[PDB]
Enzyme design. Structure first.
Site, short mmCIF file in Angstrom:
data_model
loop_
_atom_site.label_atom_id
_atom_site.label_comp_id
_atom_site.label_asym_id
_atom_site.label_seq_id
_atom_site.Cartn_x
_atom_site.Cartn_y
_atom_site.Cartn_z
N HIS A 141 0.78 -1.31 0.09
CA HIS A 141 0.03 0.12 0.17
C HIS A 141 0.85 1.29 0.08
O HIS A 141 0.31 2.42 0.14
CB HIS A 141 -0.95 -0.25 1.33
CG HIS A 141 -2.08 0.84 1.22
ND1 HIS A 141 -2.44 1.49 0.05
CD2 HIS A 141 -2.65 1.32 2.17
CE1 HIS A 141 -3.51 2.41 0.40
NE2 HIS A 141 -3.71 2.27 1.75
N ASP A 260 -2.86 -8.16 9.35
CA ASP A 260 -3.84 -6.97 10.01
C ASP A 260 -5.30 -7.48 9.65
O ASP A 260 -6.44 -6.82 10.12
CB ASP A 260 -3.69 -5.46 9.41
CG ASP A 260 -3.42 -5.26 7.79
OD1 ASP A 260 -2.96 -6.46 7.36
OD2 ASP A 260 -3.25 -4.27 7.69
#
Length: 376
Positions: A141, A260
């Site tokens: 990301h 996550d």
């Protein structure tokens, strides 16, 4: 006849992240490594030092102004920062509100973690490994000009670029929490990468964001709601990856194992156990296709280390005892001292019917790949 597994690790990465005088401060990759050795997994894989990446490698994807900024970030420059430094920290999305590599050796941290991914790609390219692991990587990301989370360079793009030197077709799969938009976008107009992203619903990666021109239908997105559990994920993951493998016939696979998506992550809302996360890798590993395994996000350090230790065992074909053997960070696994975690009470907003809906959508999309104007 076991798979040849190469595991990339820079033993100084904790020193770059926290400094040479914090050797026992818990650092997610150093602790993951500790757990892996506690289970004797070094007996079943080759441990390799990565070749460090450099600025020229980063600048294949990243802007020069960004990379030059990262070179400038030191404890001396960002402590009591000049307003011009603060403005750049904002422009390049560099968070300086935690102890971390910003305050130690940011650039060498970047060289080591990204070097692991690019070195893994090069080793797969030379056919010297069947599976190459870089837990310190998976920073999908990170933008061309902005940091994110644990990430300052997008090692995933860089690794895939490296694989494309030798492999015709790359399947990239991600099971971390956020959409790796930056990976999808880097490859959106090619059929030489198919991206399959399981992620939290957000601003990018809608179910009809499936690609452009030569890339049409080669980007798959599963935008999932809060509370995703092992059952829900399995019900989508296996059929979609089964069909992707049959139709796309990748020559190499990259699996981003962002942690996550685990239960109890303070920056994720999903509810996977380590078994449910690892089941994804187990399915991918069942194919005798070259495989790169990367880390990513994940903000409950003990759960990250457990998850990647377990997935290392899956990679090498070993079963691990749930009772944790002695390690050097034992207090962080109190009070139960187990490898596996339990899902929380969080409700799953992904209904059975939501999962069937998304499954049928993605399967239909894969069927359209067979009608593409050309074959890669």
């Amino acid at each position: 006849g076991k798979r040849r597994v190469s595991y990339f690790y820079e033993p100084m990465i904790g020193d770059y992240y926290y400094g040479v005088n914090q050797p026992t401060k818990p650092q997610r990759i150093r602790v993951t490594h500790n757990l892996i050795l506690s289970y004797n997994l070094h007996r079943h894989m080759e441990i390799n030092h990565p070749d460090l990446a450099d600025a020229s490698d980063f600048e294949k994807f990243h802007s020069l102004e960004y990379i030059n900024f990262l070179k400038s970030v030191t404890p001396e420059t960002v402590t009591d920062p000049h307003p011009s430094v603060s403005e750049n920290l904002k422009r390049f999305n560099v968070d300086v509100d935690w102890d971390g590599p910003v305050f130690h050796n940011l650039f060498d941290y970047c060289r080591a973690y990204a070097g692991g991914s690019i070195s893994a790609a090069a080793k797969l390219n030379r056919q010297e490994a069947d599976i190459a692991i870089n837990w310190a990587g998976g920073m999908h990301h990170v933008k061309k000009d902005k940091a994110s989370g644990f990430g300052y360079v997008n090692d995933v793009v860089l690794a895939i670029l490296e694989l494309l030197k030798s492999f015709k077709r790359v399947l990239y799969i991600e099971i971390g929490f956020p959409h790796g938009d930056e990976v999808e976008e880097a490859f959106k107009d090619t059929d030489r990468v198919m991206t399959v992203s399981f992620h939290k619903v957000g601003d990018t990666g809608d179910i009809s964001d499936y690609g452009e021109g030569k890339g049409q239908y080669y980007s798959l997105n599963a935008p999932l709601k809060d509370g995703l559990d092992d059952f829900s994920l399995r019900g989508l993951f296996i059929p979609v990856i089964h069909r992707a493998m049959e139709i796309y016939e990748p020559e190499v696979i990259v699996l981003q194992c962002g942690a996550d998506s685990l239960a109890g992550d303070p920056f994720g809302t999903f509810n996977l156990s380590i078994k449910g996360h690892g089941d994804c890798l187990q399915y991918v590993r069942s194919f005798n296709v070259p495989l790169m395994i990367l880390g990513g996000g994940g903000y409950t350090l003990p759960n990250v280390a457990r998850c990647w230790c377990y997935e290392t065992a899956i990679a090498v074909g070993e079963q691990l005892d749930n009772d944790l053997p002695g390690n050097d960070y034992m207090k962080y696994f109190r009070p139960d001292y187990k490898l596996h975690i339990l899902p929380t009470n969080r409700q799953n907003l992904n209904t059975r019917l939501d999962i069937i809906t998304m499954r049928e959508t993605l399967l239909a999309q894969l069927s359209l790949v067979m009608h593409a104007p050309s074959v890669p």
